[PDB]
Backbone:
């Protein structure tokens, strides 16, 4: 279905084998599937086509909301409440977006494990790799803010991590 | 209960899904890591002078 | 004969009248916080040709 | 369960209780019928071996040794009748037993069903009402002034009298109320 | 927010200007209508709260509490109109006035924007409950219960007033939004330790914290049915709401100042669940259940994690509903046998089958049967505590075992076995009591379909 | 779409229709049990088709059809796993439930609340399907708790009986003990793996640590009644015979084994947990089999047989053979449910008598019951070519051909012998000899419901092993090369069990009496485990709950410290202040003292 972007949710080309019967007995699942196709699938298809005909007579659209990019917490003065409010709201929206990205990657990982079958450990190394890097980034972003989190606390965490990295490079270059 | 069930999505969950889809598509197309461990770019962070 | 009903039904409307009055008071209270209407950096916008305010 | 107990058990009652209990446990050990007959005849011989001693001290010591014998040799899983206090169907039907006074709380539509039964119940209630004071008077007459000494109750001595405190004994629900 | 406050205030002239045989009908109908109106507050945003004005606001934590508070008054009116039949018209109207004042104070408490107005209403809620307990209580111990309930709260919360006034002097404001945006850490000083203590104990007393709960088994048992319902369902949640609000100022002092309270609560849940195993009084057992359940909310608030906050909100809502239902169920039997002993009236499933079904459902909900919202809250808090420290799982699992043990003990003792032979005045269940049970239990099951409405702002 | 998903969801959703109609005018009619039985039979017939599709192509799916809630990164959805285990176990459970319901239509005929009984049985079946088909840990927990609550409600069916309530509460306690470990596993898998779904858990755990697997083992031991938490299963025989046949015999008690089977990709990488599972299963299958050989209540004997089979299943899991354990579950269901139906038929025909000591010659009195129970015992004892031969003998062979704890191996072999030992006892004391029941003979097994319900699972217990074992794909490397004496170990030990038990039983006819030995008393009293663990810990807990927690701490010292101390101090201070006799001569002197103190203390240093 075209209801979703197939590059965000990749899927292998779906190779399936040909039915090559080697016995002379009838296949029960074939007859059962024919009965299913002509008895339950066709009425459902008819009902869905009626529903689609009804929908075609009334077509309206809903639009995805787009937000401007406002200055973030680093460009706000210490006690400027309005810039602080806008930056905090933008940070909350970015946090939700990052959570949804992690959800997308997790969905890929789950789908991949089931789809591959018994060879999943070697079959989808890439999904595991993608999830490891995304999880590491999300952890380094939001790991230990706890409740009452804010853009200021994330900024302080980033500043502390940058100081640690700068010191590590300082004593790394001295060797 | 019917009113509560059909409340408009003001918590903005589908909006977050669509924004994340857009960003993942853009970052997968151009070889970006899909997330960086730095929320704010260091070009506008002013750390103290030196370590010591 | 509205006598033997209105004297019994006038208390039955005390609460809905209060709810309507509360809604009206909420709108009037909202009218006092229009300092940043169409002024936020996220929702700053050019007005439509016929409308006067983005929200009331 | 139907008899008012006494203050204590006599020697004969204790010996009979022990005899019945030992026979039951021996039957539990001896599953087959002919073997149980053999060992029950042996048990009867063992009890009759000392039935004629006139010394109460030695008889009581024999009873003590017999109780110790039984407690050492008892079956850990003796046979219990299904409806007995230890049986698998002891209190199975106690949730189906509804007291008779619940019928007074029925709706008039429910009593429209079963009219004859409720007429009989009404005359039963009239009979119960008409006899209470006579029962109380008989009870307060036939007891010693210093309170009753036994739980046993007297019967109806006159002709128009019903036995005192009869209503809840006569109107038991059932063993199988449903 | 005035669209809810003004009708609740108008409930009073309608009550006083009603005819003596129409007070209950009008009160119940208009309370239900106010609850329906308040249902509109569940439409919360994803980022910031609903700032109605400079005085009131609403967030995702206040809305479920407001809906529960508005929904509870009709149930209290339903449960109260049985034992108040012989009252005079003036006394009935005064009782309804006390209940309406309680609702108004709670509604204005859960939406107050500043901490001083919050404190004022949070303590204004004391006088109606105190009057109810000490005037319409049944036994002679209601006076002692009222004294305990009043003085524990006041002694715990006067230092909160002093601390709030000091905070406003040092910071310039006590508006919650300004405080949250202008948050700053506490230095590890003795003065900061005592300012932490003053800002915390006021809510620990009302949770109640283990060792500070002595007032609860008295107040919840001696109060009439409506008083007990409002005490268990809403008044215990004021401490949790206040703590989740006020820990914004407190960090990082909480990282080590919470050790005694965490130890007290995680051992007191075990102690209270064990106390519930040997209780000769049913109402006392239901009261101790509340302490046992609120210790977990104390833990969740104290460990300061989003999962713990969501679990705490869900558990507060679920506990309120379940405790109210259990208190109503116990009152139904008390109004029959006129005693609170548990082993007096037994085998009640044979006599009242639909009440037996209600008892079974309430007991299943109490012991957190999946997928109840009780389970959602408790499991979220358990996971948060496991992340805090893996050894917490021992206490959490033991508490889950003992909770089911005493819940099914209470069910079996009252509803199973053989009915007492001499209690021959057990009339069939009234339509009012069955409707009360249904209106208590249906929202619980319905909230399982949309649990995000009661998971708070961290969702 | 292909029919697999639709049929797999339909066979689960059509089991709930009679639950919805529980308030309509079919629930107040004598037609309701037939309606429920027909619904179950139709559900079995419908579920037979996805099994055929898997048998053809190995088609497997996961179905996440509803999204419940999203907590930050985690997503909780109504997801169903329709893999080999689910599509193979649903038809067997539906077949057994159909047979048990048809039996219940006859055995519960005089029950005033039969409709309620049928509703309850249906509810348990729905919860079991929820447990089995679950794809995430929360859904599987929902099923885990639903089956336990239905066990509680069905064990205490006769709620006027004190022992039924006691047994129900005992089962609840023993299952909460394992629920502790279940919650431990859930919490660990959520914090560490960040998901409750099976697909994610397997992917992120290639070398699983100890804690989650030990929690899973504890939960399985609680549910499957292993040696630590065993005694609740024999006590669960208080409920009606259909409840014991359906729940505590073939479907519920295998839930812990199923849980351990579902997590085999994580248990493959842990050896300590495998060793613990092996030892626990071995000790359980020894102890319950040893307890069964001296029991006189038939239901207790079959319950101990079920517990021994569960121990053998845990042994099979502990040697890294989970598919064999699932196969043994499927085979054991048939003949163990049939054994319970035969025992219930005997109980009904002898006027509620359950002791074998009052059962005599029924070989000719009840020919069909004897035939069915003989076939069930032969299947149970791993008689060659019976449905039990395709699972239990392969289990024994695998245990013989593995790097195994030697004590566990010996205990498993002794349990295999004791199985034949106890089976012989049921036949010897129930069907051979002279009658020992009361003279009023009410024996009658000429009811079509009983006959057909027993006959269906009779045909199953005869042919299901051959039908299934030759139709599932091979997921196991076989033991193709074996010494001849070890290939025939299980048969030899079963034959020795038969002969020794028969000799010791035939010894009972002799006219000789002797007092029991201490080994007999240990075996008959269940090793004194209920005589000690049901009295000491309960007494100590209930006495500390009142003496220490209630009286000493809550009512005495917590009262002493905060409120009573301040009350006493305020009373003393009030008395001290308030007793002045109103004489000016005293407080004017006090005024002078105050005036003097003020000048020096507060005046000479401003
Ligand atoms: C999974 C089942 C699918 C069912 C399809 C839809 C069913 C909708 C039910 C809605 C809730 C029921 C209403 C509550 C009040 C009862 C009304 C009443 O007065 O009864 C008298 C009425 C008239 O008969 P009567 O002759 O007067 O009897 C007089 C005596 O009372 C004698 O009465 P009794 O002895 O017959 O007992 C009455 C009955 C009623 O008492 C109850 O306890 C029923 C309430 C349920 C349990 C309460 C605690 C559990 C909390 C979990 C919350 C889940 C929320 C789900 C959404 C709920 C939506 C409202 O009690 C029981 O029979 C045992 C109940 C325990 C069942 C097991 C529950 C735990 C596991 C279930 C998992 C739940 C998730 C499923 C989906 C999972 C993924 C697919 O009888 C009935 O109507 C019985 C109703 C059927 C019983 C419901 C049991 C299953 C429901 C579980 C949740 C529903 C899930 C729906 C989602 C779709 C799946
Ligand atoms: C393939 C090559 C390898 C070959 C292997 C071997 C080949 C064959 C060897 C055969 C050896 C003999 C097999 C039969 C065994 C005995 C049969 C029997 O029942 O005799 C009755 C006789 C007395 O019975 P009674 O009290 O007169 O009965 C009263 C009425 O008759 C009551 O009548 P009732 O109507 O209640 O009926 C009673 C019922 C119940 O009978 C009983 O009361 C006794 C049941 C328990 C013994 C059953 C054997 C279980 C052994 C498990 C050992 C596990 C380790 C335990 C370690 C514990 C450490 C403390 O009778 C039965 O169940 C039938 C007998 C057992 C049937 C199964 C026998 C075959 C399976 C075992 C042999 C397996 C052969 C193949 C093996 C393949 C792999 C190697 O007791 C015994 O002879 C057995 C005693 C052996 C165990 C003693 C353990 C020591 C106890 C005290 C130790 C010191 C403690 C100091 C204090 C410490 C405190 C810390
Ligand atoms: C007596 C006999 C019993 C058995 C017979 C029963 C007959 C069958 C009926 C059982 C139905 C099965 C339930 C299965 C769910 C179907 C309905 C479901 O889809 O709706 C839910 C919705 O339910 C509501 O969300 C629950 C409402 C919450 C409670 C309302 C409050 C009522 C006021 C009570 C006051 C209590 C205050 C306590 C604090 C709040 C799911 O929400 P959602 O997945 O999104 O819907 C997707 C589509 N939308 C978004 C466009 C709507
Ligand atoms: C019945 C239950 C009701 C509820 C009870 C609630 C309990 C409230 C207690 C809260 C605990 C924190 C209070 C004080 C904080 C730490 C206490 C002390 O042990 O810490 C050490 C302090 O060392 C010494 O112990 C000093 C404290 C000695 C005086 C306190 C004695 C209290 C004992 C009994 C308390 C009873 C509480 C209940 C009153 C009724 C740490 O050493 P140090 O790192 O150097 O100092 C850190 C503090 N700085 C940063 C400000 C410098
Ligand atoms: C029956 C009579 C009606 C028959 C006509 C309708 C035929 C089917 C058409 C339905 C329309 C499709 C539809 O349902 O839309 C999806 C819609 C919800 O939208 P979602 O985005 O998927 O999730 C909601 C939150 N975002 O699905 C539904 O709500 C209806 C069916 C849902 C499944 C049925 C409910 C089963 C679960 C019951 C509750 C169990 C407890 C909670 C689950 C615990 C799991 C961890
Ligand atoms: C975390 C806590 C861990 C659990 C440790 C012990 C649990 C505490 C026990 C609480 C008991 C107090 C209240 C319970 C209610 C009282 C009660 O039920 O009475 C006992 C009642 C009636 O006695 P019957 O034997 O059935 O008699 C029938 C004829 N009269 O029976 C019971 O259910 C008592 C059960 C108590 C169990 C306590 C011991 C359990 C310990 C298990 C140890 C094994 C651990 C598992 C190992 C797993 C390895 C992977
Ligand atoms: C420095 C000074 C600090 C002062 C702090 C005062 C705390 C406020 C509580 C005052 C309670 C005093 C109680 C009292 O003295 O009454 C004694 C009274 C006498 O009984 P009567 O019926 O009045 O007459 C008997 C003759 N027929 O004894 C009782 O029975 C007491 C009954 C109610 C007691 C209520 C006390 C509850 C206290 C809870 C703890 C909190 C107390 C306040 C301080 C908390 C500590 C920070
Ligand atoms: C039902 C029982 C409940 C009783 C609770 C009572 C204890 C409440 C906790 C302490 C209450 C008093 C704290 C003071 C209120 C806050 C004031 C504040 O935060 O400012 C501090 C003030 O700090 C103090 O003055 C502390 C005074 C403490 C004296 C009274 C001690 C009372 C007993 C303490 C322990 C009680 C707490 C736990 C008890 C639990 C109940 C047993 C900073 O002082 P600065 O003027 O700024 O100087 C620093 C810069 N130059």
Residues:
């Amino acid at each position: 279905p075209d209801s979703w972007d197939k590059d965000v949710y990749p899927e292998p080309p779906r190779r399936t084998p040909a039915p090559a019967p080697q016995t002379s007995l009838p296949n029960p699942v074939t007859y059962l599937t024919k009965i299913f196709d002509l008895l339950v699938d066709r009425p459902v298809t008819l009902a869905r086509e009626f529903i689609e005909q009804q929908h075609a007579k009334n077509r309206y659209y809903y639009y995805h909301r787009e937000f401007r990019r406002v200055p973030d917490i680093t460009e706000c003065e210490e006690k400027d409440i309005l810039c602080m409010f806008e930056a905090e709201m933008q940070w909350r929206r970015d946090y939700k977006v990052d959570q949804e990205i992690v959800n997308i990657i997790q969905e890929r990982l789950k789908a991949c494990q089931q789809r591959e079958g018994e060879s999943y450990r070697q079959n989808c190394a890439k999904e595991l790799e993608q999830f490891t890097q995304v999880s590491k980034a999300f952890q380094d972003r939001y790991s230990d803010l706890g409740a009452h989190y804010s853009a200021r606390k994330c900024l302080a965490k980033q500043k502390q991590r940058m100081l640690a990295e700068r010191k590590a490079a300082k004593e790394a270059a001295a060797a | 209960s019917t009113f509560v069930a059909y409340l408009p999505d003001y918590r903005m969950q589908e909006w977050a899904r669509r924004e994340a889809e857009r960003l993942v598509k853009y970052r997968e197309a151009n070889g970006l890591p899909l997330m960086e461990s730095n929320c704010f770019d260091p070009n506008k962070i002013q750390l103290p002078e030196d370590e010591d | 004969n509205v006598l033997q009903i209105v004297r019994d039904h006038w208390v039955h409307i005390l609460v809905p009248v209060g709810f309507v009055f509360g809604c009206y008071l909420d709108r009037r209270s909202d009218e006092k916080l229009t300092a940043f209407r169409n002024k936020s950096l996220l929702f700053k916008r050019e007005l439509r040709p016929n409308e006067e305010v983005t929200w009331k | 369960a139907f008899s008012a107990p006494a203050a204590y058990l006599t020697h004969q009652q204790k010996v009979l209780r022990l005899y019945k209990r030992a026979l039951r446990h021996l039957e539990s050990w001896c599953v087959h019928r002919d073997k149980y007959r053999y060992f029950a005849c042996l048990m009867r011989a063992r009890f009759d071996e000392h039935k004629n001693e006139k010394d109460m001290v030695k008889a009581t010591q024999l009873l003590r040794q017999a109780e110790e014998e039984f407690w050492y040799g008892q079956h850990p899983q003796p046979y219990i009748f299904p409806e007995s206090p230890g049986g698998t169907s002891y209190e199975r039907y106690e949730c189906y037993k509804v007291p008779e006074w619940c019928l007074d709380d029925w709706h008039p539509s429910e009593k429209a069903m079963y009219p004859d039964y409720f007429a009989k119940r009404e005359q039963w209630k009239r009979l119960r009402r008409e006899s209470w004071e006579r029962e109380v008077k008989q009870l307060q007459e036939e007891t010693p002034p210093g309170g009753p000494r036994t739980e046993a109750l007297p019967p109806a001595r006159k002709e128009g009298d019903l036995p005192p405190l009869w209503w809840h004994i006569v109107t038991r629900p059932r063993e199988r109320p449903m | 927010m005035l669209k809810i406050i003004i009708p609740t205030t108008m409930l009073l002239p309608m009550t006083w200007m009603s005819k003596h045989n129409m007070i209950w009908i009008n009160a119940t109908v208009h309370s239900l209508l106010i609850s329906l109106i308040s249902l509109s507050l569940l439409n919360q945003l994803g980022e910031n709260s609903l700032n109605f004005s400079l005085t009131f606001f609403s967030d995702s934590l206040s809305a479920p509490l407001l809906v529960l508070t508005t929904w509870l008054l009709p149930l209290m009116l339903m449960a109260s109109q049985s034992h108040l039949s012989k009252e005079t018209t003036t006394r009935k109207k005064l009782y309804i006035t006390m209940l309406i004042l309680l609702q108004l104070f709670l509604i204005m408490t859960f939406t107050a924007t500043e901490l001083i107005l919050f404190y004022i209403l949070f303590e204004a809620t004391l006088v109606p409950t105190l009057i109810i307990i000490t005037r319409w209580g049944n036994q002679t111990e209601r006076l002692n219960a009222g004294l305990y309930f009043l003085f524990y709260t006041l002694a715990g919360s006067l230092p909160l007033l002093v601390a709030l006034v000091y905070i406003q002097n040092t910071t310039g404001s006590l508006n919650f939004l300004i405080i949250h945006y202008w948050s700053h850490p506490l230095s590890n000083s003795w003065s900061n330790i005592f300012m932490w203590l003053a800002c915390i104990m006021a809510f620990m007393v009302k949770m109640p914290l283990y060792g500070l709960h002595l007032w609860l088994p008295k107040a919840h048992v001696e109060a009439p049915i409506a008083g007990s319902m409002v005490l268990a369902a809403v008044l215990l949640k004021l401490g949790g709401y206040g703590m989740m609000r006020i820990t914004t100022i407190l960090n990082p002092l909480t990282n080590y100042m919470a050790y005694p309270f965490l130890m007290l609560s995680m051992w007191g849940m075990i102690m209270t669940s064990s106390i519930c195993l040997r209780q000769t009084d049913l109402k006392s057992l239901i009261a101790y259940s509340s302490v046992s359940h609120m210790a977990l909310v104390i833990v969740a608030i104290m460990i300061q994690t989003p999962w713990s906050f969501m679990g705490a909100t869900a558990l507060m809502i679920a506990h309120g509903l379940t405790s109210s239902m259990l208190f109503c169920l116990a009152n139904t039997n008390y109004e029959r046998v006129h005693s609170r002993t548990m082993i007096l009236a037994r085998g009640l499933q044979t006599l009242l089958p639909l009440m037996a079904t209600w008892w079974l459902v309430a007991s299943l909900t109490n012991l957190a049967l999946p997928p109840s919202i009780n389970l959602i809250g408790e499991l979220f808090i358990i996971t948060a505590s496991f992340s805090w420290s893996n050894i917490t799982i021992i206490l959490m699992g033991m508490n889950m075992m003992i909770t089911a043990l005493y819940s099914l003990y209470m069910l079996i003792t009252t509803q199973r076995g053989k009915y007492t032979h001499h209690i021959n005045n057990i009339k069939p269940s009234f339509t009012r009591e069955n409707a009360l049970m249904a209106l208590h239990i249906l929202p619980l099951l319905l909230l399982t379909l949309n649990p995000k409405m009661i998971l708070g702002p961290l969702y | 779409m292909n029919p697999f998903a639709s049929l797999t969801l339909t066979t689960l959703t059509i089991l709930t229709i009679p639950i919805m109609m529980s308030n309509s005018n079919i629930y107040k009619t004598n037609l309701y049990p037939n309606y429920v039985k027909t619904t179950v039979s139709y559900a079995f017939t419908l579920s037979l088709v996805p099994l055929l599709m898997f048998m053809h192509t190995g088609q497997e799916m996961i179905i996440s059809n509803w999204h419940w809630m999203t907590l930050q990164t985690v997503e909780l959805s109504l997801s169903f796993k329709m893999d080999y285990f689910s599509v193979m176990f649903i038809p067997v459970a539906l077949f057994v439930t159909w047979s048990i319901m048809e039996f219940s239509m006859w055995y519960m005929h005089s029950d005033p609340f039969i409709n309620r009984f049928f509703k309850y049985l249906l509810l348990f079946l729905i919860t079991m399907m929820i447990l089995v088909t679950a794809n995430n840990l929360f859904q599987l927990f929902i099923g885990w708790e639903g089956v336990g609550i239905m066990s509680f409600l069905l064990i205490g069916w006769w709620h006027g009986r004190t022992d039924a309530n006691t047994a129900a509460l005992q089962a609840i306690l023993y299952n909460r003990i394992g629920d502790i470990g279940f919650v431990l596993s859930m919490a660990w898998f959520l914090t560490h793996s960040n998901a409750w779904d099976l697909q994610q858990i397997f992917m992120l755990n290639n070398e699983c640590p100890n804690m989650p697997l030990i929690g899973l083992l504890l939960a399985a031991a609680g549910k499957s009644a292993q040696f630590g938490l065993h005694p609740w299963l024999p006590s669960a025989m208080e409920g009606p015979t259909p409840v014991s046949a359906l729940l505590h015999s073939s479907t519920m008690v295998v839930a812990g084994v199923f849980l351990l089977i579902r997590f085999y990709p994580l248990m493959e990488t842990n050896k300590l947990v495998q060793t613990m599972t092996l030892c626990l299963g071995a000790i359980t299958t020894l102890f319950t089999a040893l307890c069964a050989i001296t029991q006189n209540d038939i239901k207790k004997i079959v319950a101990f047989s079920t517990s021994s089979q569960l121990g053998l299943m845990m042994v099979t899991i502990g040697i890294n053979q989970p598919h064999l354990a699932f196969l043994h579950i499927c085979m054991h269901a048939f003949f163990k449910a049939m054994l319970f139906m035969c025992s219930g038929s005997i109980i009904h025909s002898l006027n509620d008598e359950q002791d074998i000591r009052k059962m005599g010659g029924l070989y000719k009195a009840m020919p069909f019951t004897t035939t069915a129970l003989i076939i069930g015992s032969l299947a149970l004892t791993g008689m060659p070519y019976l449905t039990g031969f395709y699972s239990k003998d392969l289990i024994i062979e695998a245990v013989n051909m593995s790097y195994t704890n030697a004590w566990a191996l010996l205990m498993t072999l002794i349990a295999t012998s004791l199985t034949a030992a106890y089976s012989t006892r049921i036949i010897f004391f129930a069907f051979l000899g002279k009658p020992r029941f009361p003279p009023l003979v009410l024996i009658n097994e000429n009811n079509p419901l009983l006959i057909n319900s027993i006959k269906r699972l009779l045909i199953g217990s005869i042919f299901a092993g051959f039908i299934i074992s030759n139709n599932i794909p091979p997921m196991t490397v076989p033991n193709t090369t074996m010494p001849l004496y070890m290939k025939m170990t299980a048969l030899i030990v079963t034959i020795m069990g038969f002969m020794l038990a028969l000799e010791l039983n035939n010894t009972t006819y002799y006219l000789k009496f002797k007092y029991p030995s201490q080994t007999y008393k240990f075996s008959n009293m269940l090793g004194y485990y209920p005589s000690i663990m049901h009295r000491l810990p309960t007494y100590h807990n209930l006495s500390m709950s009142q003496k220490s927690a209630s009286s000493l701490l809550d009512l005495i010292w917590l009262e002493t410290i905060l409120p009573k101390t301040t009350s006493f101090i305020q009373m003393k201070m009030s008395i001290m202040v308030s007793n002045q006799k109103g004489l000016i001569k005293l407080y004017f002197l006090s005024f002078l003292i105050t005036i003097m103190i003020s000048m020096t203390l507060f005046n000479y240093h401003e």
